[PDB]
Design a protein around this ligand. Structure first.
Ligand SMILES: [Co+2]
Ligand SMILES: [Co+2]
Ligand SMILES: [Co+2]
Ligand SMILES: [Co+2]
Lengths: 157, 157, 157
């Protein structure tokens, strides 16, 4: 039995002061803290993996309620989702990732990303590819307003 | 054999109108009528299944003409597409959909989304994962001009 | 064994004269020479192929350095890509491509496209799939500023 999975993330370059309306802290969305990192690369790959295993997404495993005081570093979330993944008897068949950013050149930091993702998934550098494209100056990634990332992963077990 | 598939759909919230030019009625684009529903989730997922079997896509299984007076419900189309997909000796391995929408709040209904797809795909909920993410207020999905969804498929049999 | 591979590529429609500042001729971005041939489909497919073998992406094997003089014919880069996916011992189990574009009518030339693809990818026609959608005038594609393509590819052996 094999599992196909897909994840997708977007995050703007700007920072936002937290929303307080009426004296109350109000989150902008469901898995807000889970995504605070802004690591589009590890979140997409996370929901990809989660999605194959058929477990929802970052927002169902890390609601802002449980994520309230727990550590929200994306790498750690990756790992925790891989725990639940393996928990259903699954090894990272293979994983492919596309970062979509116009500018911040990433070629330099790419093999280092694979390295880490490999460990977090307990597979090896070879079943983990990571690339980067630009939307050729178009769209919001192109106008340099944010950065995106798509991810696919195949699961074996 | 096992087959991978992918489909993508974008829809505006706005209601466009029957185009009538010089007497004649001009058909906006091809799978226009079938899409009119604007259910990016079901359409994209359908596109993924057809793509998996190299069956084409929604604009080829449902030209405006053929779709003209044939009832435009996109759930039957998904069924249909899947009917054509068994006729090739293909069963649904598993399915994974990402819905990209800002304000529209999907968490409540996602499980009822999951429910339906499985009947139609005659598969079991457990092999149908569904999810929503937002583009962090960026893009056309973030300015609230519309909605999108990517879907991925693994066909077995 | 099986490898999942995903690819994405965006192309603008305009051309960018070759730069000259202070005498010197300045190059634009890493893989602009490759992507110059503005063929979002063959490029998106190329990357999904490499993504799965895990050879990175075009601009990797074709740096604006090597390719300083290499030919901007996306079909060649595709065959070269399929070359390395052979060394590693890989067959094209299955491929699916989605063209996101607002107006050039693709539909009539799809089939012409799948042929060339099956050619360079040495496989059968029911092995390649090419579909085309619009984003209902939303985003940079619908504003007809550019064209984008998504590809997902399976590999065997
Ligand atoms: Co995120
Ligand atoms: Co649609
Ligand atoms: Co290109
Ligand atoms: Co994609």
């Amino acid at each position: 039995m094999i599992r196909i999975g897909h994840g997708f993330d977007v995050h703007a370059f700007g920072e936002d002061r937290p929303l307080i309306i009426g004296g109350v802290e109000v989150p902008y969305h469901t898995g807000f803290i889970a995504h605070s990192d802004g690591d589009v690369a590890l979140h997409a790959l996370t929901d990809a993996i989660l999605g194959a295993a058929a477990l929802g997404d970052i927002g169902k495993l890390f609601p802002d309620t449980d994520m309230q005081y727990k550590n929200a570093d994306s790498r750690g979330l990756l790992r925790e989702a891989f725990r639940q993944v393996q928990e259903k008897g699954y090894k990272i068949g293979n994983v492919d990732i596309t970062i979509i950013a116009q500018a911040p050149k990433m070629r330099p930091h790419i093999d280092a990303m694979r390295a880490k993702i490999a460990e977090d998934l307990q597979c090896d550098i070879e079943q983990v590819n990571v690339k980067a494209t630009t939307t050729e100056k178009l769209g919001f990634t192109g106008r340099q307003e944010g950065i995106a990332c798509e991810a696919v992963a195949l699961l074996i077990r």
